[PDB]
Amino acid sequence: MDYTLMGKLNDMVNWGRKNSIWPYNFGLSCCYVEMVASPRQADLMVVAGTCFTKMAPVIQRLYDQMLEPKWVISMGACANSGGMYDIYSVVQGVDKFIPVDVYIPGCPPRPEAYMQALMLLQESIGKERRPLSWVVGDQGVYRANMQSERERKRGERIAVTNLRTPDEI
Amino acid sequence: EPAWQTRDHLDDPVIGELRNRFGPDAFTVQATRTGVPVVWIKREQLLEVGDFLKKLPKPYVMLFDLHGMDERLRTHREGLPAADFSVFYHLISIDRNRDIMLKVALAENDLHVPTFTKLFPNANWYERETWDLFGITFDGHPNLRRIMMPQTWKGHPLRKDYPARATEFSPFELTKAKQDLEMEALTFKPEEWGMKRGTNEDFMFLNLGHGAFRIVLQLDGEEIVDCVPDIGYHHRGAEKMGERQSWHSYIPYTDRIEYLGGCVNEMPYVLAVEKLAGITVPDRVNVIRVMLSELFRINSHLLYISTFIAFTDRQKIYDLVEAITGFRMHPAWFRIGGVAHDLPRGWDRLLREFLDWMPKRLASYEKAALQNTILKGRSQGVAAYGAKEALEWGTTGAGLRATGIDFDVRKARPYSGYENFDFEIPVGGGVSDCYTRVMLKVEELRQSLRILEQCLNNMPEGPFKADHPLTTPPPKERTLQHIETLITHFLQVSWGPVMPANESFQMIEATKGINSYYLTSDGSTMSYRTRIRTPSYAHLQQIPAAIRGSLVSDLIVYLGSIDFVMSDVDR
Amino acid sequence: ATIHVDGKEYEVNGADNLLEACLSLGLDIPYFCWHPALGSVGACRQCAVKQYQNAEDTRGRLVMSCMTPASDGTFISIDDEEAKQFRESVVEWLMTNHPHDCPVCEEGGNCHLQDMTVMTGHSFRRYRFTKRTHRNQDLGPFISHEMNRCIACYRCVRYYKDYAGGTDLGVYGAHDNVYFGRPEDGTLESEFSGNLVEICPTGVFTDKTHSERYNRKWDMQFAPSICQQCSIGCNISPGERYGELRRIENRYNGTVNHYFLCDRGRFGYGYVNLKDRPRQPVQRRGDDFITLNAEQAMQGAADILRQSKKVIGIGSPRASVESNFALRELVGEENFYTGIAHGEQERLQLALKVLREGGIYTPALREIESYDAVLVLGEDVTQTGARVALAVRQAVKGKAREMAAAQKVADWQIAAILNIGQRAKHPLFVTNVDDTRLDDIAAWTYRAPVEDQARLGFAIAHALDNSAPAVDGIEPELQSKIDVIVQALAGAKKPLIISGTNAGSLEVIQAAANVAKALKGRGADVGITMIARSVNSMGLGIMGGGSLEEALTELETGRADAVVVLENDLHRHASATRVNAALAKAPLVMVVDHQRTAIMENAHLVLSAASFAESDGTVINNEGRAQRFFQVYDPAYYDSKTVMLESWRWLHSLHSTLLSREVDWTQLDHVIDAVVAKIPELAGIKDAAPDATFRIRGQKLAREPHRYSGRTAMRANISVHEPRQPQDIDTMFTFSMEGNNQPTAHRSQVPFAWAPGWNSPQAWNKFQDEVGGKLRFGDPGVRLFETSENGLDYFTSVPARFQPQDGKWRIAPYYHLFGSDELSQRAPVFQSRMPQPYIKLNPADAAKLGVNAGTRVSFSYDGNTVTLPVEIAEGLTAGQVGLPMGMSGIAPVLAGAHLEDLKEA
Amino acid sequence: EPVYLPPRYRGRIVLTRDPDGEERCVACNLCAVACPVGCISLQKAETKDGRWYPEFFRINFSRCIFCGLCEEACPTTAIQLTPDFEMGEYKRQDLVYEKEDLLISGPGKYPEYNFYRMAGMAIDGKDKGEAENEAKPIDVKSLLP
Numbered sequence A: 001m002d003y004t005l006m007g008k009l010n011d012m013v014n015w016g017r018k019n020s021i022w023p024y025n026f027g028l029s030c031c032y033v034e035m036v037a038s039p040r041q042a043d044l045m046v047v048a049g050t051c052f053t054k055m056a057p058v059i060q061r062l063y064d065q066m067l068e069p070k071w072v073i074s075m076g077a078c079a080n081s082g083g084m085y086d087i088y089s090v091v092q093g094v095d096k097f098i099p100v101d102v103y104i105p106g107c108p109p110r111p112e113a114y115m116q117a118l119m120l121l122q123e124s125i126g127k128e129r130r131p132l133s134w135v136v137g138d139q140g141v142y143r144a145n146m147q148s149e150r151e152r153k154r155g156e157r158i159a160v161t162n163l164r165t166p167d168e169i
Numbered sequence B: 001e002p003a004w005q006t007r008d009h010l011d012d013p014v015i016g017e018l019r020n021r022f023g024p025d026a027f028t029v030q031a032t033r034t035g036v037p038v039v040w041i042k043r044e045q046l047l048e049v050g051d052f053l054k055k056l057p058k059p060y061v062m063l064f065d066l067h068g069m070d071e072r073l074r075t076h077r078e079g080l081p082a083a084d085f086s087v088f089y090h091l092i093s094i095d096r097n098r099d100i101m102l103k104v105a106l107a108e109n110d111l112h113v114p115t116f117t118k119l120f121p122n123a124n125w126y127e128r129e130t131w132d133l134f135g136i137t138f139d140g141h142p143n144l145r146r147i148m149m150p151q152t153w154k155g156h157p158l159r160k161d162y163p164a165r166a167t168e169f170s171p172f173e174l175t176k177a178k179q180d181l182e183m184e185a186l187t188f189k190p191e192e193w194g195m196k197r198g199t200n201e202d203f204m205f206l207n208l209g210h211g212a213f214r215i216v217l218q219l220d221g222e223e224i225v226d227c228v229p230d231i232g233y234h235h236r237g238a239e240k241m242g243e244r245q246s247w248h249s250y251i252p253y254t255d256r257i258e259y260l261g262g263c264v265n266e267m268p269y270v271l272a273v274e275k276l277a278g279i280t281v282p283d284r285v286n287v288i289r290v291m292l293s294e295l296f297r298i299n300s301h302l303l304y305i306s307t308f309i310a311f312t313d314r315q316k317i318y319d320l321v322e323a324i325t326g327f328r329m330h331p332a333w334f335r336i337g338g339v340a341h342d343l344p345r346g347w348d349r350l351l352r353e354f355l356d357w358m359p360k361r362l363a364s365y366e367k368a369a370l371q372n373t374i375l376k377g378r379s380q381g382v383a384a385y386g387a388k389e390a391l392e393w394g395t396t397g398a399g400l401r402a403t404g405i406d407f408d409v410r411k412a413r414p415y416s417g418y419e420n421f422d423f424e425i426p427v428g429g430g431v432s433d434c435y436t437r438v439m440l441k442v443e444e445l446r447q448s449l450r451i452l453e454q455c456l457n458n459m460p461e462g463p464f465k466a467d468h469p470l471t472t473p474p475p476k477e478r479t480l481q482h483i484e485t486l487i488t489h490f491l492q493v494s495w496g497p498v499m500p501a502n503e504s505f506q507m508i509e510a511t512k513g514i515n516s517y518y519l520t521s522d523g524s525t526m527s528y529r530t531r532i533r534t535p536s537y538a539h540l541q542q543i544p545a546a547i548r549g550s551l552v553s554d555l556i557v558y559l560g561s562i563d564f565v566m567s568d569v570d571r
Numbered sequence C: 001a002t003i004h005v006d007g008k009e010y011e012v013n014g015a016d017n018l019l020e021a022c023l024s025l026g027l028d029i030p031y032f033c034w035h036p037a038l039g040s041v042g043a044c045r046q047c048a049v050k051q052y053q054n055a056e057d058t059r060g061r062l063v064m065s066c067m068t069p070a071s072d073g074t075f076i077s078i079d080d081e082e083a084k085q086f087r088e089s090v091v092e093w094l095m096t097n098h099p100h101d102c103p104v105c106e107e108g109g110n111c112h113l114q115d116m117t118v119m120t121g122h123s124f125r126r127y128r129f130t131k132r133t134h135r136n137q138d139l140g141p142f143i144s145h146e147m148n149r150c151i152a153c154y155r156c157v158r159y160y161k162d163y164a165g166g167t168d169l170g171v172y173g174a175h176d177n178v179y180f181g182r183p184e185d186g187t188l189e190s191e192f193s194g195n196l197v198e199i200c201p202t203g204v205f206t207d208k209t210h211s212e213r214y215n216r217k218w219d220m221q222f223a224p225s226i227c228q229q230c231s232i233g234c235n236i237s238p239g240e241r242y243g244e245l246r247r248i249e250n251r252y253n254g255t256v257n258h259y260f261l262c263d264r265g266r267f268g269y270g271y272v273n274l275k276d277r278p279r280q281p282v283q284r285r286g287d288d289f290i291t292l293n294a295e296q297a298m299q300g301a302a303d304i305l306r307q308s309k310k311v312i313g314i315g316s317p318r319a320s321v322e323s324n325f326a327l328r329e330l331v332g333e334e335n336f337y338t339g340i341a342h343g344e345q346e347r348l349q350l351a352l353k354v355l356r357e358g359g360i361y362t363p364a365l366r367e368i369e370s371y372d373a374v375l376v377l378g379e380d381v382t383q384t385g386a387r388v389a390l391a392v393r394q395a396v397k398g399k400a401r402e403m404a405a406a407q408k409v410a411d412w413q414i415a416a417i418l419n420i421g422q423r424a425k426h427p428l429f430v431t432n433v434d435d436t437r438l439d440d441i442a443a444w445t446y447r448a449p450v451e452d453q454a455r456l457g458f459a460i461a462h463a464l465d466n467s468a469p470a471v472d473g474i475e476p477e478l479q480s481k482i483d484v485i486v487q488a489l490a491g492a493k494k495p496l497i498i499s500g501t502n503a504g505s506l507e508v509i510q511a512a513a514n515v516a517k518a519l520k521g522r523g524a525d526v527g528i529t530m531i532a533r534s535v536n537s538m539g540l541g542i543m544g545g546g547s548l549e550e551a552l553t554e555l556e557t558g559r560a561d562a563v564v565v566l567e568n569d570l571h572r573h574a575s576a577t578r579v580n581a582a583l584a585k586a587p588l589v590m591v592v593d594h595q596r597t598a599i600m601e602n603a604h605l606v607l608s609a610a611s612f613a614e615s616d617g618t619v620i621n622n623e624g625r626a627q628r629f630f631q632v633y634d635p636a637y638y639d640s641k642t643v644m645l646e647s648w649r650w651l652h653s654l655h656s657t658l659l660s661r662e663v664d665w666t667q668l669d670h671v672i673d674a675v676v677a678k679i680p681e682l683a684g685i686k687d688a689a690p691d692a693t694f695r696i697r698g699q700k701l702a703r704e705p706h707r708y709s710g711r712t713a714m715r716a717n718i719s720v721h722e723p724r725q726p727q728d729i730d731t732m733f734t735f736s737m738e739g740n741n742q743p744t745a746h747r748s749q750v751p752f753a754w755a756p757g758w759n760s761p762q763a764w765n766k767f768q769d770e771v772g773g774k775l776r777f778g779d780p781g782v783r784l785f786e787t788s789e790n791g792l793d794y795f796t797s798v799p800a801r802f803q804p805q806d807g808k809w810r811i812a813p814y815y816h817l818f819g820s821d822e823l824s825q826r827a828p829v830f831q832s833r834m835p836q837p838y839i840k841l842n843p844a845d846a847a848k849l850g851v852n853a854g855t856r857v858s859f860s861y862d863g864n865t866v867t868l869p870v871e872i873a874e875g876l877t878a879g880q881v882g883l884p885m886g887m888s889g890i891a892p893v894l895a896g897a898h899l900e901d902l903k904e905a
Numbered sequence D: 001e002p003v004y005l006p007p008r009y010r011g012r013i014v015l016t017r018d019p020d021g022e023e024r025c026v027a028c029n030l031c032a033v034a035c036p037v038g039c040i041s042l043q044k045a046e047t048k049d050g051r052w053y054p055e056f057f058r059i060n061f062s063r064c065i066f067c068g069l070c071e072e073a074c075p076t077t078a079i080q081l082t083p084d085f086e087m088g089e090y091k092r093q094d095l096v097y098e099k100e101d102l103l104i105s106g107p108g109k110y111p112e113y114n115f116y117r118m119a120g121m122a123i124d125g126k127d128k129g130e131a132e133n134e135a136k137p138i139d140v141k142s143l144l145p
């Protein structure tokens, strides 16, 4: 499989990083109170809310305080793209200024959607290659171009025929 | 004579009193559907009229609202004075159980009004926001700075020539804003905030980190001498979106203001749109709306009490609301003229299972609240204010009733058939501390369960949407079968329903106080002006005047005791 | 007059009906069968108000506001409960048979019936029985027919028959089975059949060309533009979606084209959407075609222009004033050549001299409908200036209007007027080389060669005024008909003389000027109209320059070694062999064009210019009216690599890169200021539209409706990140709905009509001062010149009569509305409507040739032998041979040329 | 354990089919204009028999707030919000769902409705007068008065 810019220990390191993930939950807006550690110790940043223009610098600074390796999960349509607030005071997506590894649609997403995002991030971490040391070898991060989730789940989604009618609970 | 009929309220005694005091030619009475006497005052008589209303035999004691309107694009301005901008002042008399709206007309070249901070101190933040969003100066204001936008903001976003949509992002301006946020503590100037005596030299200035916002603190050791809360970090431009969505498609945005509220925030918007539309909704709509608003009020109160001191009760409410509307947090389910669907088959089983399982939890909550001596030592007596302080700062909801002032919207000014439900309004002593507010919220939880029992027990049979032609959208089976209904649905979901030109107003008792929607229609399919008064704004402005001489931990407890969210503050 | 509507006093015109008076006051009354241009009939019964006898009358009576005069002391109630009930009932009765078709109906969101159903307040069906249904007809490539949606309001037949004069649309049947259509399947024959898609208040008649690529009205990006398909300059609203031009709606102009277009301007927009258009600058290097961006194309072109000795510029009457001026500045005034031939230019400048020096006032297109007698000399008006033909038809019906006004019958009561004036009509005298489409209402038609038409004009002028030069050899029967024309023209209060450059004769224009001068000498209120050939023919004539023949001479002699061709294919104004040889001799050919023309194979650089949809500019009417057209959309919004700039932008940056070696993408108002500074006779174009700093209370004018959809998904397949909204530095319009389109805004350029509650083309009533009048703050456009104080002299160059000489064949020009224009005949929907290439012959000439109808003859013109099949034309004269101008292989410059070796293939 | 979602739950959006097996969408664009976010984009095409269908159909799910206004506005019940919430993606470009990612093989939550059985427009298999509550077309040349 393709990647984007002696071997078993790399899988060991990936397994250690994958099973041990410490989040920093950014409050921001109502995606946070749906879904419910200093940034120095946390390695995953969960942006859950509208990226307002007055606190885009706060998000950028608290992202810059984290240490490599670092991953970003964007919950909610606001953090994905701006959502419904295509308005003057709202940044249209947190991926305008920080790199995002997993996106979850929803307004808000369910907590189980965040669990699914955690599983997706865990697979992404497990299938990537990072430098072991900063003195030996290539000092480049190899992200894997994984198969998209909407094309992976296309067969069972298209195969759906009948649903329950909305007149009952 | 329906409730939504356009009236001028010339039979109001305030109009006769103002005429006998200032003369008949001093003001212009406007006919609205706000339910309020709207009078247009000269700018030079404005402080005189405010002082006269403050000293009536049953005086107008509370400034409910103060904001601006851009009247330049308003075409249907018949019977109105010539204005390029206007400032409106909503004043509430509780003894009279009335309210009045004063309006001051302003030309484009002379945008300045005398300030009301000598009459009503909440006009401080109201006038700062009116300056920030419309560009109107208020002469005599102590510190007229921006409150929603950053101080280095170009233009006033609520003006009609300001584009609503998001401009191009720039890392350039982003790194400037980051570098001024890094150097803010080094270059803190304590008169760009309204502070004084900045470094005495024993005084220390800090910044503190229900939403995320900053509050600048001035300390004598550990005692708070002055504080200013920095808000606007959660500003979404919801009122501007009101000017850029159709009447129907603005409903989700009404949900996302005060996000713990859901249908409680949905309610005053559709009530004001139905006042604009001349719609009277049937009783089944009234009971469905009351039931959903009380379910969400119970959810919000449980979250507030759990935060102040759980997950199962709110989960049961969320499953019931998810079964009715299809969504937990932002149902988007109230409609103009009714509700989006009928109740699902099995709603009563879920509500009966929720109501048969709740009273023992309520007894547990009362045990954990009124028998907790650690909480009863930590909470009462701190950040306490009386009735006079709550009236002058626009405090509504649990704080106002905890001061002994028996004012609830659901009883004084009933809406959506709340007079058909038997429920009590808890009022406390004369002291509004953390403890009395928490027990008032517990008693309101009990009363909301009573209202839910009455919603379940005698639920009307009938339509869930009105027979009115302006009901948006029309019933879906007639839309899918009948051509005139298909036509009405077509033009109501595409161009939008046409509300004839009028001004409407609805205030309701939200989960955190009084929430009101003031809607101005220019005869089009969008709102000309959407003014949203939220209680968390007025409650946050009272924070400096309530903890003068307290400690920082006392400030933290006060912040916990106030039911507020930043989306409600900033909208 | 004084009326009282619901107790409110209003001052109105007493000569109007109550429906138009109340619509002019902003009051909303539902209506179907009334049109401002068609008058009142009282069919649909929708416009009911309640009339009272006086102020102290309570019971009233329901009257029909379109059939009730707005007299003094009138008392009506619109919001009476009985009137409201009856209007809802009328909507209900229409709804009983209406199909459940709105999602699959092209009228949806633009439907007057949808608007009036919503306005009356009818949304509940209590009808349980069956609906009547109808079979549909095939009405040709442009109009789609769906008779189920009809509400039997008779607007289509009233327009198509009483107004447009067409004969193949009617109403058939009876009680509730009335059917509106053709007597059989086939193409609608009228040149103004396209206006049925806006006359019909339902989805019965719809734009088939738009139905191919349908999008709803709220999804369009609209701009106010000028139609480019002939010289009349009708105001249009082109609307786009997803980067392609989707529809041409009519844009109301109370001075030019009020409610109506012609079929060419309405349906020949499809050349904009062609996939072979230049979208990027391309440089020829050997046999390779290297694609460049704007900067390096300008650098390479500027280097090649700087190393050359003389650079000539060949403009076009297609291009705007700004583009032609930019080319004139780039190459120099003495090096600038108009791209038209010498004879075409001579006829054009004579038409301009008659217009702006002859001392006779040239009417606007709307004002043509008030003239009492019409003489058309040489110009096939229906095929070259069709809206002038429609206005001529209205002026002809003016006689019935006067007769009905004599009997105190109101002007809106169209059935009474048409009954009183049965077949009486104002005198119309047309001349052509054959039959025209105005012969049904012409008092006389003269089929003759252009020399004999000019001689008839000179003889009419001599009989009106003896100081005009006399014509010898007039036959006694032709002299009797000339005396008939003279008696009709002399007795008219307002005569109108129409001619143009399409007849291919200088002497026809001279004769028309002579007739107009003779009528002006008798004190008559005479007007003269000249039909130019292209959209900016009079602008290119006012600018001036050498002919195309001079430019080809410069290229062939080697005096010019670099040629810049602007929006010109060069084959419609000169022979293709000569053009090809001259362009092959040049070491630099640079073609700035928006259509893939045939001269791009020899071109060394091709600049992808913008068409009228992708550009701004100014064009000059056939009556000398300067009109701005604004850009509809950004071509680079969807395809990021598209470099398709305005022609004047390309040429101004090329001039700047030639002078100071830096690119300069200027602004439109800078180019307009340069035009009005350097050319004082074009100084009126500054006031054609306001500058880019014009605001309505601080905001720009919106190009798209306020309910525009798909903002965050229309480009998501290219990139999920939303691009920046396109910036329009050139005009006062914004490429978004963040702007103003209020009907009460103080402007004259309205991109599209929409009001809350009026989503149809009936929304134009809100944007007008009175309905059927002008726009509320005046029509857009400005006349360049006024009527001169002093006239011309009589032209004394009277031609001799046509002599049919053996071996030669005089080429008589036949024009077709679908085919003669260049860009519109490139549009793919026109090939179905295009006539087959047929060469017209007299029966005597064809019998002499041994050739019957349909067999193919071969003739050689300019060393090129081509073969066409023969159609017999009885109306032609012997010694003439008929050719369709502007088609494939037949340049319009052949009009008046001779033919050799016409023999059967 | 699997999560329980009620039938009204507003989750992943699909385009459904009629009982005959053809796609219900007539490309009327009412969903796109009723979307307050503007994250629906489609284009009308027509079959040889005159049936309106979407040439393409795309939804920006990174923008979509799952409000259900499109389903409420659909007059054919083609577009529906289904009880499914597992839509997390690695790339935001993969959150733009084309017609191949939205068109399921059944009627979804409305098992029987067919808009083209009620419309008067003639398509293949439904001539004039063959729809619901519709009389046969009376020819204008009929002998009956």
Ligand code: SF4
Pocket (backbone or CB within 6 Å): A029, A030, A031, A032, A048, A049, A050, A075, A076, A077, A078, A079, A083, A106, A107, A108, A109, B256, D065
């Ligand atoms: S995506 Fe929706 S739920 Fe999440 S922060 Fe935005 S508005 Fe709130």
Ligand code: SF4
Pocket (backbone or CB within 6 Å): B487, C098, C099, C100, C101, C102, C105, C106, C107, C108, C109, C111, C112, C113, C114, C149, C201, C202, C203, C204
């Ligand atoms: S003509 Fe109008 S009302 Fe009738 S189907 Fe078409 S859009 Fe609907």
Ligand code: SF4
Pocket (backbone or CB within 6 Å): C149, C150, C151, C152, C153, C154, C155, C156, C157, C180, C199, C200, C201, C202, C204, C205
């Ligand atoms: S086809 Fe159209 S214009 Fe003609 S009568 Fe029917 S609805 Fe009226």
Ligand code: SF4
Pocket (backbone or CB within 6 Å): C227, C228, C229, C230, C231, C232, C233, C234, C257, C261, C262, C263, C264, C265, C266, C385, C386, C387, C388
């Ligand atoms: S008359 Fe000429 S300018 Fe007018 S629409 Fe037709 S082609 Fe265009």
Ligand code: SF4
Pocket (backbone or CB within 6 Å): D034, D035, D036, D037, D038, D039, D040, D059, D063, D064, D065, D066, D067, D068, D069, D070, D071
């Ligand atoms: S659910 Fe709402 S936001 Fe999502 S596509 Fe439908 S209308 Fe748009």
Ligand code: SF4
Pocket (backbone or CB within 6 Å): C103, D024, D025, D026, D027, D028, D029, D030, D031, D032, D042, D073, D074, D075, D076, D077, D078, D079
């Ligand atoms: S509203 Fe329904 S039928 Fe219309 S375009 Fe959308 S999915 Fe298709």
Ligand code: FES
Pocket (backbone or CB within 6 Å): C019, C030, C031, C032, C033, C034, C041, C042, C043, C044, C045, C046, C047, C064, C065, C066, C067
């Ligand atoms: S508009 Fe008057 S009856 Fe038709």
Ligand SMILES: [Ca+2]
Pocket (backbone or CB within 6 Å): C615, C616, C631, C728, C730
């Ligand atoms: Ca431009």
